[PDB]
Amino acid sequence: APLGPDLNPYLSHLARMYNGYAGGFEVQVILAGNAFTAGKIIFAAVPPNFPTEGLSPSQVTMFPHIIVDVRQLEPVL
Amino acid sequence: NVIDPWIRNNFVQAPGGEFTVSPRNAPGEILWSAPLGPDLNPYLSHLARMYNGYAGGFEVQVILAGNAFTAGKIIFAAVPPNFPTEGLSPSQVTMFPHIIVDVRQLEPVLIPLPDVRNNFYHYNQSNDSTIKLIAMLYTPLRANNAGEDVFTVSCRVLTRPSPDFDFIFLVPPTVESRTKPFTVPILTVEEMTNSRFPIPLEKLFTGPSGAFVVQPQNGRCTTDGVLLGTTQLSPVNICTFRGDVTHIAGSRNYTMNLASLNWNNYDPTEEIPAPLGTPDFVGKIQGVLTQTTKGDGSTRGHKATVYTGSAPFTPKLGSVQFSTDTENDFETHQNTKFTPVGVIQDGSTTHRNEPQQWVLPSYSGRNVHNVHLAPAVAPTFPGEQLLFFRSTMPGCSGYPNMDLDCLLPQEWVQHFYQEAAPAQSDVALLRFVNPDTGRVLFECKLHKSGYVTVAHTGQHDLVIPPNGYFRFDSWVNQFYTLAPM
Amino acid sequence: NVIDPWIRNNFVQAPGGEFTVSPRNAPGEILWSAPLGPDLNPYLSHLARMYNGYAGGFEVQVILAGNAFTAGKIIFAAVPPNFPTEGLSPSQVTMFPHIIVDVRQLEPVLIPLPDVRNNFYHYNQSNDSTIKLIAMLYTPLRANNAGEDVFTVSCRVLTRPSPDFDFIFLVPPTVESRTKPFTVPILTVEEMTNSRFPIPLEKLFTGPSGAFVVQPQNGRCTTDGVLLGTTQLSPVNICTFRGDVTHIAGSRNYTMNLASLNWNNYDPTEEIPAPLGTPDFVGKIQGVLTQTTKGDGSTRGHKATVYTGSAPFTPKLGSVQFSTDTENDFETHQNTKFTPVGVIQDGSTTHRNEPQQWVLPSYSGRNVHNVHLAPAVAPTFPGEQLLFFRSTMPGCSGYPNMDLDCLLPQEWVQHFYQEAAPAQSDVALLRFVNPDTGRVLFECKLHKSGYVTVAHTGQHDLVIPPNGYFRFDSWVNQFYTLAPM
Amino acid sequence: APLGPDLNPYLSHLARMYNGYAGGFEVQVILAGNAFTAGKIIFAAVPPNFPTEGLSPSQVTMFPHIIVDVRQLEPVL
């Protein structure tokens, strides 16, 4: 998905009031966790020009990234 | 650290970096330039695509055909690509980074090429390219030899990568699938055959769509190979008959319950106006009816006279009458086969009338209209004229409408069925090139619908060389107008 | 030394594998075939397109995904480089170094291969064929459950080179293209037409080469398009004649002042056996002679009986006799044309005799034989049988020798004329493929002169699916034989 | 040709810009071609209304002028 302030619909309907914005924003993810399941997941950071179609599960690790498994009972950012 | 050191330590020439220098050229003028980039070493080209991100400069150098008898200086420099130099000076380039040398030198010399980089990396394709090349002369090099070519000094520019160079990113790129290049058949029309009658064509014709109500069913196909109309593939199946006759003793006729090419009986429930390859125009044609008894080979053969406009001729129903020159020769329900040779002008009356090439026959008799008819044609871009294929038909009696204009060559139909090439844009551009001239004599406008036209006025049987092939060139839009012939 | 670390460190996919296994199976079954090499990895196929020298090995690596409770096993193995693997035994697979693998292992599996090397190099711009790939089903993997064919078990290949593997030599890339890739028409026998008579083909035939003198002159061309024999381009131009008949006023005969396809007056001095479209056999045939007066078109047409075994049949000299049914109708010095329809049997009292399809007629007469002979055919790697094209010609009188065998398909000749392809080795490999199943009924052995044989014995009209087409594969040497039928 | 500030495109622009005009120039000529010809060229002054089509070179010798051969490498003024 395109990272931007177009994610929170409240931020959408309060974006139009102001023409200039700055600063980042942090997001997180939750999972349907299960102690019987074993499988890891990987999220990362990528500039938008960089075309990824079928490259690897490996070569994204040079970027900023984070790895977690499918069993987790907390949100992770 | 991802390069074999041969590439790192061996200068390579340019793909085109060669330029003549004569004393006859004026000083302070340009000689040669090139976009500076990693698109210079062809090895760097074919190892650029593997990596999406690169950085760092690279140094190049130049060699000269040196000579101790010649005196003339040269100047190379550094220039941002926006900076337009057409005729400025031999002087004002000196504010930049530059280097000067004379034409007598027995070593390669390298231009300085300053690092404007701030450790930033482009993408691999980045064409907004900096530090573009330079070829400037300084003194016009009298050369003191007084020949016809007074030391015409040649030279090459010579490139390699820098030490600090890399290929950061990674990708599996590809050019995986090439579309078919829309290859056109390279016969001539005299070599090519009529698609609405089993004859070879004789010439092509140019004429307007308003003259004749142009809507045939034989010779109708797409550009990717979808079968349309009654157009089939085997050109001998055009206007011929196969089936099982039924007969009456009194007249010269046999109503023939039709069959396919392999004599499987015709079924009237296909999405068709008529069987494939039927004559799609009203006429009276005399060929030869030929019957073999299907047991061991009791044959017979006589000429016949068929009537494509009449009512017992019902191809969509599956019965056809042939008024032969005999009456009861052809036996019952055998392999009876009509094959046309020539059109006749029966029962006197008016000359040059039959066949009525632009009207549709009695497919289902007089009752049921022809369903799933291929569309008619007209120049949607106005002023143009359709490209007919003109021949004369044979005959046994009279002066019939022998002037036959078909739409397509049959070999092109099966060839484009073999092509299976989807069109990229609407209208293709084909050029009739004569290789005896090595050039075009006339071009044409070909749509992806499956008909071709040209923007020239009047009735023209185009004079053609018998050796001229056809050369497809390019893809025009819907509104190209052709130049006159 | 020459290569990147990362591409050697970890495994990377292969595009040919990735394939799935449904639980409905029959064991001892081959699933997927592939040739091993550096063209497996797209990375390595690029890098080997770049270079020349090629030495080391790989590690083939396989991951499975699907069900677990199946209890069914898979085999990956080595193979001889030319080895039929269709319905064979799994014990043969047990002779080679192989690995049995069940779906219960989570770790991705690796099959080791024979380990050799030839340290000078391996070509890498050739066939250079080596151990191909074996995807072999051990245990039919039933997946006992309530579902039907559920959890389709996928099988991927994801490799990386062996740590000894490396390159040595580098070339300019020259990535562009091959020659003509020897494309074939995809027609059937009903769509293809006879190259010795204007009729559609009926069936292909195989039979012994010692039966007849197998040397025609219509249907002769090269694999790159030089005109051989009396073979021409158009299928309707065969066996028909054009010119200016002269009144044999006492009989039905007509000696014709010879004209070409374009009615150009015939030159008897050309380096040819006979004019184009001229027959290459002895037989009696009734077709129809047709004449149109050049002034206005006073048309006439009557059935003519021709004899290429006759004395006034002299096509190389410039005269040919036509015994019509009428005697004085056809005017002299007019555009007179004979067209045949089918061979007859007036005969010498012998049934099924004409055309004597293998003998040669009187081109320059009986006195001096034909010149510039396209030679006969022969199975050079013997024990194999030729390829005939069995057809049936019609008739008008008697019981003719209807079994007509021609040499090439006429569409394929002009197809090669468009190709103009230079050969790569001795014998090409074409496969008759039934696309209803995507499987081959029989293969072929096409020789670079322009003929083709098959490795079988006996008189067989080859049964074919009428949806079946032909698909070119590769270049085989002149010492490999095919499987019989 | 007529001499003036419209000779140099630089100066023709700059004199289109301005009004007042005073001083002179230095006309400077370079040759390029053969050397073994032994043939000479004259550049001269002229009356401002003077027919010059088929006239005498002695008239050209009356005005301040310069004879120049092709053998000089230095550009002539």
Which amino acid would we find at residue B351?
A: H
Here the contacts of B331-335 (C-beta below 8 Å, separation 24 or greater) are: B331/B291, B331/B293, B331/B298, B331/B300, B332/B245, B332/B246, B332/B247, B333/B244, B333/B245, B333/B246, B334/B244, B334/B245, B334/B291, B334/B292, B334/B293, B334/B294, B335/B242, B335/B263, B335/B291, B335/B292, B335/B293, B335/B294
Its sign, for the CA torsion B274, B277, B280, B284, is negative
Chain B residues close to D73, C-beta within 8 Å: 142
Residues with Cβ within 8 Å of residue B288, at least 6 apart in sequence? B301, B302, B303, B304, B338, B339, B341, C287, C288, C303, C341, C396
- Contact predicate B429/B411, CB 8 Å: no
CB atoms A56 and C12 under 8 Å = yes
**CB-CB contact of C370 with C218 (8 Å):** no
Residues 6+ apart with CB under 8 A from C382: none
Residue C277 gets which letter from DSSP?
A: T
Contact A55 B123 (CB under 8 A): no
Structural element, H or E, at residue C292: strand C284-292
Q: Which residues contact D73 (CB under 8 A, 6 or more apart)?
A: B142
Chain A residues close to C108, C-beta within 8 Å? none
- Rounded to whole angstroms, the Cα distance separating C127 from C121 reads 14
Query: C193 with C50: CB under 8 angstroms?
Result: no
For residue C400, give both structure tokens: 């003719």
From residue C289, alpha-carbon distances to B111, B367, B395, B396, C302 in Å are 84, 38, 10, 10, 5
Query: Between D32, D35, D36, which is nearest B140 by CB?
Result: D32
Q: Are A12 and A18 in contact (CB under 8 A)?
A: no
Beta pairing, strands A66-69 & C427-434: unpaired
Q: Do A49 and B123 touch (CB under 8 A)?
A: yes
Tokens 């010149």, located at residue: C371
What is the C-alpha separation between B77 and B96, in angstroms, rounded? 7
Range 456-475 of B in CB contact (< 8 A) with C: 466
**Any residues with CB less than 8 A from the CB of C438 and at least 6 apart, and which?**
none
The number of C-beta contacts closer than 8 angstroms across A and B is 10
| C-alpha to C-alpha distance for C65 and C252, rounded to whole angstroms | 83
Find chain C residues with C-beta within 8 A of A57's C-beta.
Answer: none
**Whole-angstrom distance, CA of residue B202 vs CA of residue B406:** 11
**Token reading at C242:** 């054009």
Q: What gap in Å lies between CA C373 and CA C170, rounded to an integer?
A: 49
Q: Do B26 and D36 touch (CB under 8 A)?
A: no
Whether C289 contacts C304, CB under 8 Å = yes
- Do the Cβ atoms of C161 and C59 come closer than 8 Å? yes
**Chain C hits for B47, Cβ within 8 Å:** 50
Taking CB atoms and an 8 Å limit, are B146 and D36 in contact across chains? Answer: yes
Chain B hits for C42, CB-CB cut-off 8 Å, are 172, 174
**Any residues with CB less than 8 A from the CB of C414 and at least 6 apart, and which?**
B411, C233
What DSSP line would sit under B96-157, residue for residue?
SS-EEEES--SS-EE--------S----TT--S--S----EESS----S--SSSTT-B-EEE
Q: Cβ of D32 under 8 Å from any chain B Cβ?
A: yes
Does A53 lie at the interface with C, CB-CB under 8 angstroms? no
Q: Measuring CA to CA, which residue among B238, B279, B241, B283 is closest to residue B400?
A: B283
How many Å apart are CA B291 and CA B336, to the nearest integer?
A: 4
C80 and chain B in contact, CB less than 8 A: no
For chain C, say whether B46 makes contact (Cβ under 8 Å).
Answer: yes
Which chain A residue's Cα is nearest to C42? Answer: A55
Locate tokens 């990568």: which residue? Answer: B161
Q: Are C42 and C136 in contact, with CB atoms under 8 Å apart? A: no
Subunits adjacent to chain D (3 or more Cβ pairs under 8 Å): B
The answer to whether B26 faces chain D, any CB pair under 8 Å, is: yes
Dihedral-angle region of residue C28 (phi above 0 means left; psi in -120 to 50 means alpha; beta otherwise)? left
Q: Would you say B65 and B84 are in contact if contact means Cβ atoms under 8 Å apart?
A: no
Rounded CA-CA distance C378/C384 in Å is 10
Does residue C411 belong to the interface with chain B, where contact is any CB pair within 8 Å? yes
Q: Does B287 touch chain D (CB under 8 A)?
A: no
Distance, in Å, from the CA atom of D28 to the CA atom of D37, rounded to the nearest integer, reads 22
Rounded to the nearest 5°, which phi and psi values hold at A60?
-80, -10
Cross-strand pairs, C246: C255
Record: contact C6-A56, CB cut-off 8 A = no
CA angle A32, A37, A38 (to 5 degrees): 115
| Amino acid at site B225 | G
- Resolution (in Å) of the shown entry? 4.1
With the CA atoms of B241, B242, B244 and B250 taken in that order, what torsion angle do they form, in degrees rounded to the nearest 10?
30
Helix (H) or strand (E) holding C65: strand C58-65
How far apart CA B452 and CA B454 sit, in angstroms, is 7
Q: Residue B120 and residue C341: Cα distance in Å, rounded? A: 80
Say how many CB pairs under 8 Å bridge A and C: 4
Quote the strand ranges of C168-253, DSSP E: 203-207, 241-247
DSSP state of C5: H
Distances (CA, A) of A4 to A17, A26, C131, C192: 17, 11, 53, 63
Q: How far is A28 from chain C (nearest CA, A)?
A: 30
Answer whether A28 touches B (CB < 8 Å).
no
DSSP code for B84: -
Give dist(CA B409, CA B184) in Å, integer.
11
Interface check for C9 against chain A (CB to CB < 8 A): the answer is no
Distance from the A65 Cα atom to the nearest Cα atom in chain C, whole angstroms: 19
- How far CA C330 is from CA of B286, C333, C406, in Å, comes to 17, 10, 33
Phi first, then psi: give them for residue B43, nearest 5 degrees.
-65, -40
- Contact partners for chain B, using 3 or more CB pairs closer than 8 A, are A, C, D
- Separation between Cα atoms, residue B10 and residue B3, nearest integer Å: 12
Q: If you count DSSP H runs as helices and E runs as strands, how many of each does chain D have, helices first?
A: 2, 2
Q: Measure the CA dihedral B320/B322/B327/B332, to 10°.
A: -40
What are the residue ranges of helices labelled H in chain A?
9-13
Contacts of C292 in chain B (CB under 8 A): 392, 394-395
Q: Which residues on B lie below 8 Å from A55 (Cβ)?
A: 170-172
Are A59 and C6 a contacting pair at CB < 8 A? yes
User: Degrees (nearest 5) of the Cα angle C444, B420, B261?
Assistant: 65
Let me know if chains D and A touch, i.e. at least 3 Cβ pairs under 8 angstroms.
no
Bridge partners, residue B203, by sequence: B390
Question: B7: part of which helix (H) or strand (E)?
Answer: helix B5-8
For C390, the token pair is 């069995």
